[PDB]
Design a protein around this ligand. Structure first.
Ligand SMILES: Cc1ncc(COP(=O)(O)O)c(CNc2cccc(C(=O)O)c2)c1O
Ligand SMILES: Cc1ncc(COP(=O)(O)O)c(CNc2cccc(C(=O)O)c2)c1O
Lengths: 427, 427
């Protein structure tokens, strides 16, 4: 069929010469777009010159030292300890072990349960798939493992009932309290959440949600962990998604955001309280000192430098983010089977619905999303279909003109979509 | 104070100008040695030119297609389905989930327990740490998780009593049968082992061990899994360690040996029975090659091509392997506190012992190993201490002269070690 032949900026090309507008590469964290020659050079040099680690060497690799130094400058107050891995899935798994070790060290070994959310996603390790709330992943491996619990997701469109979003955000956060009390606070180690659920369909919680979650976590002496694997490194306009929603996690996980997707890498960023805890047990100290594939760290360093020095993150907050959000809602809000148009910064979405009046979803959630996605692709546009949610997360460097080009095509596709719907009486 | 400044061939350099022999090949993984400029070029080109999706519409990324095509040529017959990951740890975790999903699809809901070995090592995830048998690891994330069991390792020097190695291989393999009947066969999904235990100290099992493990696995309808993360890609003289020992696994896992450590990557090679069983449910399907990274696949491709086309693996079997093994046994067999001199291909080891007569180990296993290791480093030689086992696995490209050079230095270090023992009355 059609193979990929080239990537540059926000586009990729196929073997037939088609230019494909990549409206989703940020879900794989390609935040600065394709074709960065300087990143390629950063990798080339490190691979030619240096070893890939070995030991005894009282030192941390110079590529890693530099990356760590730079990250301290761009992360929020209190994150000055970073543990490197090879992926977001590994970062999640390491985080689970850290959270449990922290409580062990505090002399509370029974505090082992982590609480996630249905439709949350935290990667594909046994630990991560257990903490995530995708039912199809739980079946593959008799998951979740012990010390994993789940609460319903803050999806107002489905569960918001007769409530305003804001009233719902309180109710949905209180589900965490209910679960903690059910399990017992002294068996609960942490609550873990993506600031905006990514793979679950860009579920943007109400403004009252995260503050209520945080309040509840502190009330019960439970750690708060953000999974920033999608939302970090400028996706919401802030450097990290938790900054946008105004909560303060005790740890947070990131992945290819570090490298804009150019090479595999992940990290766990550990706040002061937990860091002091772990080091006191002498734990994770070899990881903190020797973690990080130096080639990937070299690319990650060039990337984070670029995001800062080129003003890419600031440009999402001030310029392209507001432009995108306005243009997104302008384009999609009018369609008959489009509802819950949403987004922050450079992540945005809507849901294909049976009936906007009744807030009624299509049956066999996903079938209609697939149809819309298929139309997009026939028209040389990629966006992600998550059930009947259509989601977009383009490179952060996307211009105002590229935004319009993308939305012009998407608009044409929705017009076709609305017609195809009626034409088979699914409307 | 010193830092790494260069790697080339079998050598490393530090900031002081010191030339160091890398007898440990990074982390047993740098099989082609350092300084491959063609590898760096392969990464540069992919990073400059292409997107990073593993799949595009009906096709796979060209770099991945290429790697899989080449892998099919060098893998044992029947292993065409490969699932890519970012590390050996992720490969192990994916294997565990695959093993369990397979029995689910087969309608055997009880059949979920994986059996590993004490002193076995399968990575650092919750899943891999649980399947591994490192007692210090059994309480970082609350471990082992359920459906994990362990048998004793086939370590003749310690457990062999008054048996020949061949008699002991049968006894040590039958511990698996004893364990299966203790648990109940209906509950046991797989046995997993490194053909030779790596991090555990290059524990080479008797020739009788693997054939007997395999008979037992087939007798109870238990899957047989090889962890080739250290033994893979030519380390034993064969492409994979299971080929050397003459067993036929249903799946096997591989890590960065695939790329000689130049970039992070791993794989699960899935045999026909399990692949078909997973297809028969539609499980680990839509998103198979889709966990790894295509830049890493391009490097892995150049590496596997180099191992085949430059005759590196064949040279281990026919030339440098026999030489290393012969010369290793000449060099070390004579020392008063060195015993169990062993190895195959380009992995080899010996154990530091209190008394060769009684076969008595030093107390506080590890203390003496560290002492000997520090001597090596002071002498610009990297060899690994696992407890009181000393281990070596240099790049496979090491010349006969490089072999003697390494052994010349090692011999001098053992002379010094032997003096140090008496000069402390620890002889
Ligand atoms: C929130 C979150 N956490 C952890 C992971 C695991 O990261 P790695 O993939 O680096 O192991 C993820 C996965 N991140 C991810 C990557 C690509 C696509 C999509 C999508 O659903 O479109 C999501 C994720 O979305
Ligand atoms: C047998 C085995 N299985 C899985 C893993 C995990 O692979 P990754 O590390 O690629 O995730 C390993 C780890 N392999 C490994 C790596 C680095 C050092 C050492 C050492 O003990 O010197 C061993 C291993 O030795």
């Amino acid at each position: 069929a059609r193979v990929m032949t080239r990537g540059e900026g926000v586009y990729l090309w196929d073997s037939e010469g088609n230019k494909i507008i990549d409206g989703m590469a940020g879900l794989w964290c390609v935040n600065v777009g394709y074709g960065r020659k300087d990143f390629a050079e950063a990798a080339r040099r490190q691979m030619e010159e240096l070893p890939f680690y070995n030991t005894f060497f009282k030192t941390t690799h110079p590529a890693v030292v530099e990356l760590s130094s730079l990250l301290a400058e761009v992360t929020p107050a209190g994150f000055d300890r970073v543990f490197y891995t090879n992926s977001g899935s590994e970062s999640v798994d390491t985080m689970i072990r850290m959270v449990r070790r922290y409580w062990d060290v505090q002399g509370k070994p029974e505090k082992k349960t982590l609480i996630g959310r249905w439709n949350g996603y935290h990667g594909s390790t046994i630990g991560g798939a257990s903490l995530g709330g995708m039912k199809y992943m739980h079946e593959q491996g008799d998951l979740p493992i012990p010390g994993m619990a789940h609460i319903e997701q803050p999806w107002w469109y489905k569960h918001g009932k007769d409530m305003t979003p804001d009233e719902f955000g309180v109710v949905a956060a209180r589900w965490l309290e209910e679960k903690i009390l059910e399990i017992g606070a002294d068996k609960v180690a942490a609550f873990v959440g993506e600031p905006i659920q990514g793979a679950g369909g860009v579920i943007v919680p109400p403004a009252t949600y995260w503050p209520e979650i945080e309040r509840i976590c502190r009330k019960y002496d439970v750690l708060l962990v953000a999974d920033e694997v999608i939302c970090g490194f400028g996706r919401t306009g802030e450097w990290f998604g938790h900054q946008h929603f105004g909560f303060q996690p005790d740890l947070f996980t990131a992945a290819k955001g570090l490298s804009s997707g150019y090479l595999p890498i992940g990290a766990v960023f550990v706040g002061k309280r937990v860091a002091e805890g772990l080091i006191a047990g002498g734990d994770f100290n070899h990881g903190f000192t020797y973690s990080g594939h130096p080639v990937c760290a070299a690319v990650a360093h060039a990337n984070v430098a670029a995001l800062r020095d080129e003003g890419i993150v600031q440009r999402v907050k001030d310029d392209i983010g507001p432009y995108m959000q306005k243009r997104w809602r302008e384009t999609f809000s009018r369609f008959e089977h489009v509802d819950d148009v949403r987004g922050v910064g450079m992540v945005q979405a809507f849901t294909l619905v049976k009936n906007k009046a009744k807030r009624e979803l299509f049956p066999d959630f996903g079938e209609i999303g697939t149809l819309c996605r298929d139309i997009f692709f026939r028209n040389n546009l990629i966006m992600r279909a998550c059930g009947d949610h259509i989601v977009s997360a383009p490179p952060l460097v996307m211009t105002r003109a590229e935004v319009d080009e993308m939305l012009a095509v998407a608009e044409r596709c929705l017009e076709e979509f609305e017609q195809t719907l009626k034409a088979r009486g699914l409307a």
